[PDB]
Design a protein around this ligand. Structure first.
Ligand SMILES: C[C@@H](C(=O)N1CCOCC1)N1CC[C@H](NS(=O)(=O)/C=C/c2ccc(Cl)s2)C1=O
Lengths: 52, 234
């Protein structure tokens, strides 16, 4: 279990293996955080979140 | 939905309900964005004229979050066939944008490969709707949801009297009394990953509801992610 196969590569959302490296990305309406792993909602009511 | 439980406040905010001229729900849908609803192509033959309701959890009371939207464009997959329900997918463009709020928010569209390797290999997904609570009963006035295990593709094909194509997958239970049902059709199947819910299926068909040795059959959304993206661009 390497890269994306190992805990989703530490990504919050989408994981792809590019060259031999984990690359994370996010659904529309999120931006990838500075650590290149977390996904940050760009505004209110981001997709996929139950409403509180 | 047979079995499962009610969607509690804010838990199923991507649910849409197709309503006929009598203001009765006949099919579900999934909110994809402020202008677009995902539904089943077969649902488009169950009414002459319909609108889309969102924000509703209890169709008997006015909770204040509800909004009815008229449809501007119906985009049905051109390969849909009633004989097998292959390509059972459609997208609706609304005349006016949905206002997101408590109980009204979109589900995320995943990327294909990641969804196939990571979402669809999860133990369960969640199906939701206003359909019947038993095969022979009436529609629920309450929005319900249900955890449904993903079912091994071979086992499902073994179990089925009708062809399971590559545009379909199976979910639910061999004998346990829990399944989607009539009126749930067109609704969301979503998969949770790290507290974010992604569209993975569209409620499509079943041999009745929750029958022994029968499973629920869902449109495979991952097969249609390019198609969806194109449909939403115009
Ligand atoms: C077998 C199928 C059917 O008539 N087909 C399937 C293949 O294409 C030709 C017609 N069928 C029999 C009646 C049934 N209608 S229904 O009860 O409204 C659904 C119920 C569902 C249970 C689980 C899911 Cl997912 S949804 C249904 O879809």
């Amino acid at each position: 279990r390497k890269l994306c196969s190992l805990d989703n590569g530490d990504c919050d959302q989408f994981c792809h293996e590019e060259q031999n490296s984990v690359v994370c990305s996010c659904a529309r309406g999120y931006t990838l955080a500075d650590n290149g792993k977390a996904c940050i909602p760009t505004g209110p009511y981001p997709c996929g979140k139950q409403t509180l | 939905i047979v079995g499962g439980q009610e969607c509690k406040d804010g838990e199923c905010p991507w649910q849409a309900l197709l309503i006929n001229e009598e203001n009765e729900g006949f099919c579900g849908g999934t909110i994809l964005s402020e202008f677009y609803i995902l539904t089943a192509a077969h649902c488009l033959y169950q009414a002459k004229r319909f609108k889309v309701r969102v924000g509703d959890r209890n169709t008997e009371q006015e909770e204040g979050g509800e909004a009815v939207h008229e449809v501007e464009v119906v985009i049905k997959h051109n390969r849909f066939t009633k004989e097998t329900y292959d390509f059972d997918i459609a997208v609706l463009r609304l005349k006016t944008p949905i206002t997101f709020r408590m109980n009204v928010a979109p589900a995320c569209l995943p990327e294909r490969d990641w969804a196939e390797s990571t979402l669809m290999t999860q133990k369960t997904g969640i199906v939701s709707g206003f359909g019947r609570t038993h095969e022979k009963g009436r529609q629920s006035t309450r929005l319900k949801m249900l955890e449904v295990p993903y079912v091994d593709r071979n086992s499902c094909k073994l179990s089925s009297s009708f062809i399971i194509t590559q545009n379909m997958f199976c979910a639910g239970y061999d004998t346990k009394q829990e399944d989607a049902c009539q009126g749930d059709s067109g609704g969301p199947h979503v998969t949770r990953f790290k507290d974010t819910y992604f569209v993975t299926g569209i409620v499509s068909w079943g041999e009745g509801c929750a029958r022994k040795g029968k499973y629920g059959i869902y449109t495979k959304v991952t097969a249609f992610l390019k198609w969806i993206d194109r449909s939403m661009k115009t």
